Design a protein. Sequence first.
Lengths: 49, 120, 254, 99, 162, 99, 50
Amino acid sequence: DSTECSNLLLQYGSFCTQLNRALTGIAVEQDKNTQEVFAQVKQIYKTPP
Amino acid sequence: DSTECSNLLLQYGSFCTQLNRALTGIAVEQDKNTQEVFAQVKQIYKTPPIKDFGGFNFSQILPDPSKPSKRSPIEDLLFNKVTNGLTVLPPLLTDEMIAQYTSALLAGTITSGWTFGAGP
Amino acid sequence: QCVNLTTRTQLPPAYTNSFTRGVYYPDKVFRSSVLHSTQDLFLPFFSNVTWFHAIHKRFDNPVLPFNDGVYFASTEKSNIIRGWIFGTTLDSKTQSLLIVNNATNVVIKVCEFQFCNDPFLGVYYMESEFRVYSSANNCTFEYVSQPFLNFKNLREFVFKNIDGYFKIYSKHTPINLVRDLPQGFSALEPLVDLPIGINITRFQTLLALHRSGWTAGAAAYYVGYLQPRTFLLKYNENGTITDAVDCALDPLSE
Amino acid sequence: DSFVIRGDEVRQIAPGQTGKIADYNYKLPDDFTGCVIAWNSNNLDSKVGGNYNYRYRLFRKSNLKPFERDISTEIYQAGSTPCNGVEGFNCYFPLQSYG
Amino acid sequence: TKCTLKSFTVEKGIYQTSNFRVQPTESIVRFPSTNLVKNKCVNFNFNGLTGTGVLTESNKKFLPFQQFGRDIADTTDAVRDPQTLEILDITPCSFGGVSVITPGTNTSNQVAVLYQGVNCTEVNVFQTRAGCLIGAEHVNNSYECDIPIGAGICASYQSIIA
Amino acid sequence: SALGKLQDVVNQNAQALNTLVKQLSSNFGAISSVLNDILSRLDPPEAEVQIDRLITGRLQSLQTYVTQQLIRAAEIRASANLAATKMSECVLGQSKRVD
Amino acid sequence: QIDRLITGRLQSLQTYVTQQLIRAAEIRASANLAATKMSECVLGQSKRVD
Ligand SMILES: *[C@@H]1O[C@H](CO)[C@@H](O[C@@H]2O[C@H](CO)[C@@H](O)[C@H](O)[C@H]2NC(C)=O)[C@H](O)[C@H]1NC(C)=O
Ligand SMILES: *[C@@H]1O[C@H](CO)[C@@H](O[C@@H]2O[C@H](CO)[C@@H](O)[C@H](O)[C@H]2NC(C)=O)[C@H](O)[C@H]1NC(C)=O
Ligand SMILES: *[C@@H]1O[C@H](CO)[C@@H](O)[C@H](O)[C@H]1NC(C)=O
Ligand SMILES: *[C@@H]1O[C@H](CO)[C@@H](O)[C@H](O)[C@H]1NC(C)=O
Ligand SMILES: *[C@@H]1O[C@H](CO)[C@@H](O)[C@H](O)[C@H]1NC(C)=O
Ligand SMILES: *[C@@H]1O[C@H](CO)[C@@H](O)[C@H](O)[C@H]1NC(C)=O
Ligand SMILES: *[C@@H]1O[C@H](CO)[C@@H](O)[C@H](O)[C@H]1NC(C)=O
C-alpha cells in the first residue's frame, strides 16, 4: 500500500503488465488442458440400471 | 550511437553475445520447423491436365492457374484471413514455395495414394 | 471606474450533462491511425457541468474556484462574452491575469490589477464602456494577438496552469441547438501557451452589457472542472482526434 | 605529485570534481587509485610581505587531461581581439601568483 | 568470422559477424542554424529535439499546432522545419546485420557478405529480399540449398554462386 | 475466429516487440530515458551512474524478452513437431489412431 | 532503499514467473499426452506398443 513505492515502480514501465499477462496465459492454459483431456465427448452417456 | 554507453556496457561482459546467439538459434529453429513440416517429399508431383477422378472435385484445394500466387482457393482465403536495432529476417521458404510443397503433396496423395510416402 | 449592478434577479445556477465534450489535444504531436493512452488533466465524460445564464434579468458573474483546471463552454450569439480574469485575491496585493477581446484585438496582460466587484464591457445602441480594473502598477507580461472569436456559435476553452505555464485550448463549432450543450465529440485544438508563472486559484467571466439602465444579451456558459485521469484517444488517417474513451468512467470503457 | 594550493582547493584534488585547478592545473581521472595528502604549511610557505612564489593557471582554452602538465607561458585571448603574444585589452598572462 | 567464432577453421555455412550502421555524414541544426540537407543520413536538431536519420519530403498533413510527428512506438518519424513550414519524414538510418557466407576453410578461403535488410545502393552485387549480397554471382539455374541465405535464396561453392 | 491459433502467435510476437521497444521510454529510476539528454546535461561521473541505470533496465528488459521468446519457440517447436507428425501420418498414409 | 527493495522483489517475481512458464510448458506437454491417451486408448483400441 506504499504510494512512494508505486511511484518509484512506475519508472520501470510495463514489467508488471508482462508478469500479469504471462500468469493469465498460464491460468487459461490450465483450463484449456483440462478441456482437451476430459471434454472429448459432447453426449453425456449413462449405463443401464 | 552513444560511445560512453557502449564503454559502460562492455563492463557487463558477453550478455549481448548470449542474447544474439539465443535469437539466432530461434531463427534457425523456425526454418528447421518449416523444413520438417512441409519438405517431406523430394519429388515435385503434378496433377494430370484432365481432372477425371471419378466424380471427385479437388478444385478448392488444388492450385488455381488464374491466380498469380499459384495458391488454392482455400489457401488464398487463409492468406487473406490472416493479418532501434530490431530486424525481421525473412523465412527461408517463401509462401509460393510452401504452396508448391503443399501442391506436390496434394498431387502425390491424389494420383498415388500413400505409395509416394513410402517409396516410388 | 466601477459600477454595482443592482437590478439582477435571484436564481440558483443550473447543472447539466457534459456528454463527451472537453477533450483537447494533450500535446503538439501529430499521430495518425493510432490509439493513444494519455494521463492528463481531463474533463470526465457525462459529468455535472455548471450552467450559467445571461438573459433578460440574469447576469451571472459569480466567484468561482479554479482548482486544477477549468473547461469553459459558451453557447453564444451576438458576441457578449469577451474575456476572463485569473488570479488568487483579484486585487493589487497579488498578480493577476487579464484576457480581453475588444472590438479590435485580443489583449493578454499580467499585472497587479485592482479589480472591480463587477467587471464588464459595454456596447451602446459601438463599444464605449470598459470597467474591469481601477489600476495597473506592475506589469510583467503583455501579449496582443488576433481575435479568437437561437444560439449559433459554440466556444470551447480549456485553461490549465502547470509549472508556471498557462495552457489555453480552443475550439470553435457551428451549432444550431437552442438551449443546452449539443451531444457529440469535438477535440479542442491548443490555442496558446503563456509563460505567466503566477498563482491562480480563482477566475471570473467577463461579459458585455447592452445599453439603449442596462440590458443583458442572450448568452449561456458552462463551467466544468478538470481531474487527473486517463483517456484513450483515436487518431484517424488525417491526424484528427475523432473519438475518445474515458478509462475510469464505466467497466466497458475501462 | 607535489604542489602547494589554497585551503579551499584541497577538495578539488579528487576524482570527479568541478573546480579551477582541477580543470587548468591538475586533473585526476575517474578511475584514480592512490591517496591524496594535504597539510597546512603556513609556517613555511608564507611570508608577512606576501609569498608570491606559488602560481596557478588562471586562464586556459580547454580543460586538461588527467595527469597532464601545462608549463607553456603563452598568452591567452580572452576577447574577440587577437593578442599576437602581446598583453593588452582582454590579453592576460595565464599564470598568476597566490598572495 | 574466425575472430567471432574463436576458431581458426570455419565450417561451411552462414555466420552473423557484425553490424552495419550508416554513419551520420553531417550535423544539421534548425532553430527559429545551419542549412537543411535532405536524403542523407545526418544528425538533426529540430527545436532542441535531437536525433539521427534521413530527411525526406513528406506527404503528411500536419495541422498548424502540430510540430513533430510520432509513430506507433513514439519515435519521431516526421518533423516540421521551424523556418520554412514544410514536413519531412525521418527514416531511420540504414542498419543491418553483416553475415559472412563461406564454405569450409579446408575447401576454400573465398567469402561473400550479406547485409541484411539493406538495399544495395547504400553500401558481384546482387539485391535479394533478405538483403544485399556482395561477392556471390547470381545464376539463373536452380539447385538444392547448400548454405541458406533467405527468401528462397541459397548459396553454394562450385567461386561462390547464389 | 476460425484462424485464431495463427493470429494468436502473430499477435504475441508483435506485442512482445512493441513491449520491448516501449521499454526504451522508461528511465528505470534515472533522470531521463534519453541518453543524449543525460550526456548533455550531466558530467561523466554522474552521467555514468545514470547510463548504468538505463543499461541495467534495458538489459533486464532484453533478457526477459529473450526468455519468453525461447519459451514460445519451444511451444512452436512442439506444435511444429505435431504438425510434421500429422503430415506424415494423416496425409502420407491412413492412420488408425483415433481422433 | 525502496529502489533496492523494488529491484530485488522484481527479480524474485521474474524468476517465479519464468519457472512457472517452464512448468506450464511441462504440464502442457503432459496434458497433450493425456489427451492423446484419452483419444487412442479409451475411445479406441491402439496398436501402438506400450
Ligand atoms: C468442381 O468444383 C468447382 C467449384 O465448385 C466447379 O466450378 C464451378 O463451375 C460452375 C459451372 O460452370 C460455375 O458456375 C462456378 O462459379 C464454378 N466455381 C468456381 C469456384 O470456379 C467445377 O465445375 C467442378 N467440376 C469440375 C469438373 O471441375
Ligand atoms: C460594488 O459592490 C461591492 C460589494 O459591496 C463593493 O465592495 C465593497 O466596498 C466597500 C467600500 O466601502 C468595502 O468596505 C467592502 O468591504 C467591499 N466589499 C467587498 C466584498 O469587497 C464595491 O465598492 C462596490 N462598488 C462601488 C463603485 O461602490
Ligand atoms: C449536479 O449537482 C447538483 C448539486 O451540486 C445536484 O443537485 C444535481 O442533481 C447534479 N446533477 C447530476 C446529473 O448529478
Ligand atoms: C482594445 O484594447 C487595446 C489595448 O488596451 C486598445 O489599444 C484598443 O484601442 C482597444 N480597442 C477599442 C476599440 O477599444
Ligand atoms: C509593485 O508596485 C508597487 C507600487 O506601484 C511598488 O511599490 C512595488 O515595488 C512593485 N513591486 C514590483 C515587484 O514591481
Ligand atoms: C497559491 O494560493 C493559494 C491560496 O492563496 C495557496 O494556498 C497556495 O499555497 C499558493 N501556491 C503557491 C505556489 O504560491
Ligand atoms: C481524410 O481526408 C481525406 C481527404 O484529405 C478525406 O477524403 C477523408 O474522408 C478524411 N477522413 C476522415 C475520417 O475524415
